[PDB]
Amino acid sequence: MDIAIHHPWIRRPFFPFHSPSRLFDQFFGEHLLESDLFPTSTSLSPFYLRPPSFLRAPSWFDTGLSEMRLEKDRFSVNLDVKHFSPEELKVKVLGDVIEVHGKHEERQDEHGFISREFHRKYRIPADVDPLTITSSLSSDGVLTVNGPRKQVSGPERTIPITREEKPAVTAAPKK
Amino acid sequence: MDIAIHHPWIRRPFFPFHSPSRLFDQFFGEHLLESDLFPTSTSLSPFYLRPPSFLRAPSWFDTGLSEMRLEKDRFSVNLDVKHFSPEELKVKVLGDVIEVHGKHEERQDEHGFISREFHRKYRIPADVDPLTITSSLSSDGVLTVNGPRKQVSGPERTIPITREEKPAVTAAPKK
Amino acid sequence: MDIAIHHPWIRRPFFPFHSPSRLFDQFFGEHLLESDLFPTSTSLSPFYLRPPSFLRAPSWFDTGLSEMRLEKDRFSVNLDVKHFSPEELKVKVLGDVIEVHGKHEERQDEHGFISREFHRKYRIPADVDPLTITSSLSSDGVLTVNGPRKQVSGPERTIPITREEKPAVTAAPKK
Amino acid sequence: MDIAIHHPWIRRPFFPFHSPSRLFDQFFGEHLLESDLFPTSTSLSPFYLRPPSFLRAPSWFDTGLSEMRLEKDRFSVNLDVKHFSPEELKVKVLGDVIEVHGKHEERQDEHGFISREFHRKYRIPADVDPLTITSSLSSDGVLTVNGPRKQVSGPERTIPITREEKPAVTAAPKK
Amino acid sequence: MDIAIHHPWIRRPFFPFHSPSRLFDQFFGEHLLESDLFPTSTSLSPFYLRPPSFLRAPSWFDTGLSEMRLEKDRFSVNLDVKHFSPEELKVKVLGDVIEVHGKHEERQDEHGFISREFHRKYRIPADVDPLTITSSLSSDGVLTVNGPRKQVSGPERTIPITREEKPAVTAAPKK
Amino acid sequence: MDIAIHHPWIRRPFFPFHSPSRLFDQFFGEHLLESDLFPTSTSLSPFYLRPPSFLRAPSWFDTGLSEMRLEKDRFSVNLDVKHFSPEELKVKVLGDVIEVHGKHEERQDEHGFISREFHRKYRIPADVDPLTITSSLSSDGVLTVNGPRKQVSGPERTIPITREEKPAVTAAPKK
Amino acid sequence: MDIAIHHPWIRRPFFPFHSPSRLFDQFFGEHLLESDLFPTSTSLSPFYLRPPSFLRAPSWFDTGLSEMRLEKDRFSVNLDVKHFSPEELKVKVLGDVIEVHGKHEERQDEHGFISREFHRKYRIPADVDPLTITSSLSSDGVLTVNGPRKQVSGPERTIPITREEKPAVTAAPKK
Amino acid sequence: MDIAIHHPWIRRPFFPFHSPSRLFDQFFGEHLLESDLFPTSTSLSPFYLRPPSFLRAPSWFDTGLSEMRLEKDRFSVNLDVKHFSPEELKVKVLGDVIEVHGKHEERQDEHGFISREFHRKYRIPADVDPLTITSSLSSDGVLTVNGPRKQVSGPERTIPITREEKPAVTAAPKK
Amino acid sequence: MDIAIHHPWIRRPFFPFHSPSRLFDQFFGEHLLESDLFPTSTSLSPFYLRPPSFLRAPSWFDTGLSEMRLEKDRFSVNLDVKHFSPEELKVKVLGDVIEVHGKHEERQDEHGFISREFHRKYRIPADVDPLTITSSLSSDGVLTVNGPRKQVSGPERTIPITREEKPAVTAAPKK
């Protein structure tokens, strides 16, 4: 844990290409995402949906897919955060449950400040696997949890214990 | 660390592997990020990363498989509670994780009472489904979770947030 | 900050404000502390700190006013909850601070449920009195905290305790 | 947050007048308070009260005032802590509520130590404004929260929600 | 609290004999314990018990003693932790109550790990005095709280308050 | 701490004590650890340690006694609560520690209510025994804990764990 | 500078822009130098430099325009010389820069003569053309430069000379 | 001397005294030097230095009475010479200091002679007066200085020299 | 190796191994040097060194045995020379070390001749005796060293010369 040795020694080899931001693996990753999802060089390959939005000029489409084949396949789910909240949002991958918690103050009044909040609750063990599902985000709050998938889905438990039914028992007369 | 020994020596059995692009972590990282966006005419991969190999005939791809499932069928798992502890045991089915917490005082002394406890931690996704998996306790403590299976799980913490096209910051000279 | 530039430069326009007593923070601080004890034949003032001004005709005094009250009358006020959340909303009147916490799930997906939330933070002491301010809810979510008004508030953290006549300490050489 | 640069650089200019205690702004303030409240140079200006005390030689008077005029006036409330507890007391200005919590062990027995505690609860929004009310303790525990004032006073809330009375209702026959 | 001065200055005089374990005051104390409790050079004199164990070759004997004379008495109680748990063990001397909490995973399965736990609860104020009782753990988790002793033993409280019985009483007619 | 003065001076009135074995803390520490195992042929010892003394005729031993009990009898200790607080008082008998927590508001102001509190902390082992020791409250606040006694207590934190027979570690050259 | 704050913070709202090529100043600099040689198949470009933008639909190019021309028409600009100075004024038409230098002594004292001066600096290329633009003076000092227009100018100092294919230098070790 | 502890802590029980003029040693030193020149309408004082006190009713002044005389009357002081030494004793009356030097050999050995000596140092000004104070010797060694008294003395070394109006020195740059 | 982690962690699993005498290498070294002089009353040892063990019943001693002989019989070892090299092979019996050096050119190219070489290094003391062990070559290269055996060998370099008796040296201060 050489904080005064390794830390300044690991940030050194980064200098030859260090200066822009602290996060270099998402703008170039999403820039390629919006460019790879578009028929470049080759041509054709779509599939989407469309939920309610406040936008009049543009439109917010809830991205989604589905597939299965040989022995390998990718997938990507998109959370909902119409308004960006980079610092005011926290993504949590609690097992087979993906949830987003973003709150941003976009509406302002005299002495009162309004703060909207978007919270999604996804329980898709068939599309999620914490040991592989990561999380992406857009400048418009568009969260995108990419990664493989599996199966199964259910919260219920059902676990009875004891009950006996072996020693002490009851009964009644008969004939 | 003998910089005058370990450095030239640790760089000895490295030559036949050398010349792997000084920026191998980023070069291949981009190609893997491109195939992580849209199914790039591959044999459909969840995260199969094409790595540098000496294999000339076949094409190797970094994969998991042996980290999700292995040897399961269609039975019931049995927890361990050597000594009976009906009232003093609590079985919890938290997702694909089956656990048992049973504590019973079997050893006694003058003014000191000994209490033994058995705690099992089962992270069997392809063997447990919280929705159907139930529990059956015996009079000796033998706990048995019965039910079907088939699914993958595994709690990880790999969710890089922020970084989402359109930011921009600035600075200025100082002293 | 080039000490050989910013120092002599930042000390240039300062000329017409220079000669303000090397110990201005303590000199005036004592005079302000003297008038903060007993109404010293002044035009009465909570904290009218007589500062050094260039105004020859009038005498300026540091004050607040524009940081407590402004434009109010009788009012009724109105919180914001675009979408109805009767059972899923909690209005809290914590002193001169009116807040609303309403969360309703209006957007739904396959296995993911979206939940929007509206949270208003009103720091209106001039139009809020917890003793007489009530709350009325509409079927659309429109909240209305009607009632009288007139008051001032504002949570700060300026309470320098300790030091209170007759203490005494000491020390001695060391090495 | 240059703790190893700014901290030792800001305490440097304090050296020319350093060495005494570490709360220079409270003894000189109270010393002037007990000297300004006394007709010095000029003459006359009183107003006080008197609660029960254990002191036989001296007397503990609960200080208090009241006034209103143009649009600016000062004020000062005094908490109660007969026995000093500089380190064992905490003053809290929770909005329009001033409370003092001081506990000092003045009575001692064989193997039992007695500890008295003084706790005041002030709900004076008319004499308190957290955004300007400070605190000044005495060597005898005499706490004094000085600062401006305003108006209003009340804890009750009264905020009914829903009730409906619009759609589904009830009635009875008639003629 | 000179962490960057005293710390490296106190570990300096230890170097002349520093290199082995981080603890040098227990192996020698237990090695001498198992050697002093054995008739060496002189004659002999024992006293013990024997509880249920899983060991077939050896045997776990619950050590214990008892004595009283003049005004001096040695004593040592032994907690129970059959399997070693150096790191996974926490001894607590909460007053006249000695408790041990050790949990170690000795049984392993496919994807399920078993973890046994030994917890003793001693309420011996007659053999314990936190102001003198210490602890000594043995390789086989054999904990041994050595130290003097005193008397008394009991948890019950029984502290009735008020009841009145003086003012405001009840009665009934008579003749 | 003039090293050229305090060092030779602090070692001056120490000569007649010098030559106490450079490793006195370990030398005697071993002999005291040997007599702490088995009741070695002596007048027993709760923790009597043979220290280096100038006494030629008698043999001195490090003892306690005066740190456990002193002057007690049948007794019936009394707590202190100057002002009655029947409903506002809580007597707690936590082991050999008797405490009283009574708070009553006897002083009142305009909008500020004063509340006095009496808290006693009695650590009398030779006077308290949780079982029998009860409590009796008066109408003036005079609390009285009556009952027998005889026992010693004292919550300390001296329990060195680990160093439990046969461990072993290892290392290697580095830089 | 707070390298432990400003550095990671100034890189925060920079992620969505990150990955702009560690050598962005040279990468794009080469592409801009290529299009600056021969009129590459484009809508031409005085110096339009294709920059990295988030605009997906349109293609943005860095340009000037609003730094040469703006709002002009058949004009006859007029300089300012409030007080007449026929013999004491000099109008200079240095290219697309019209200037006036008039100094007249209107204020007089005992032995001190005051002299006011009006100096205008007009850099209007789209309004001036030294060849045609003339000047007309009034009796009050109102100077008026009449004539056509249409032109662009602006004195800059960006002219790299050195470097021109076929150089070569050398050196050698030293100490 | 933890500067990060002793400094802020030692500056704690000094607050109530704090703000006593950063130049207290010179400020009051001047006022004491002014009253040391001419009897400034005071109650006359050799060195009554008016110090800063918390006493509000009375005015305190630095005295010295308890450092000159105390419990004397009109008798004769007796020196100590347990063993007679008429010819081997020398009494000296050096001002207000009475001393006795008597040495007699009372213990004898083989070839070694022991000599005991009694030396008294009396600095009693209010009991001695070189003029009248005489000395009477007894046959047992009991010395007795008889005579009146009343006087004050005490050898000190506080006589600053030089610094007498009209000096002047000078210097110049160097390197 | 983080001295703030590895140091306290590499001494942790050393816990009950400590107290092995800070000078263990010299303490036991002396006892081993004493038993290396005269055959001290023991079961005779070549170099058995009584080490510190946890074994209570048996006494362990550092020994060799498994570093001299193992599994042998009459035997007639045979070297390996896949391809015959009668004239191009040299068998050397240097003590208890049998070696073979045969080189034969079996592969031929245009102007390049390949030469294979087989070299065996046998350090079998319990199988070789230079005096009797002979060598027999076959026509295929199969070398066979036949003969009896029984012996121990092994070239080492442990001969610390010097350190005789009565030398005497000296030095003196310098600078």
XYZ file of C-alpha atoms in Angstrom, chain F residues 161-175, chain I residues 1 6 9-19 54 56:
30
model
C -4.666 -12.793 22.314
C -2.937 -15.161 19.867
C 0.644 -16.494 20.065
C -0.998 -19.832 20.456
C 1.670 -22.606 20.215
C 3.486 -23.470 16.935
C 2.795 -20.822 14.198
C 5.737 -19.815 11.897
C 6.067 -17.375 8.978
C 8.678 -16.522 6.370
C 10.074 -13.790 4.149
C 12.679 -13.058 1.491
C 15.048 -10.315 0.219
C 13.463 -7.402 -1.643
C 13.832 -3.716 -2.540
C 7.323 -5.146 0.905
C 4.351 -7.172 5.642
C 1.929 -9.644 9.020
C 5.103 -11.706 8.613
C 5.420 -11.687 12.384
C 1.788 -12.669 12.884
C 1.905 -16.357 11.791
C 5.117 -16.343 13.867
C 3.047 -15.610 16.972
C 3.667 -18.852 19.046
C 7.121 -19.457 17.464
C 8.674 -16.382 18.977
C 10.720 -16.416 22.167
C 6.767 -28.739 19.693
C 6.455 -33.278 23.761
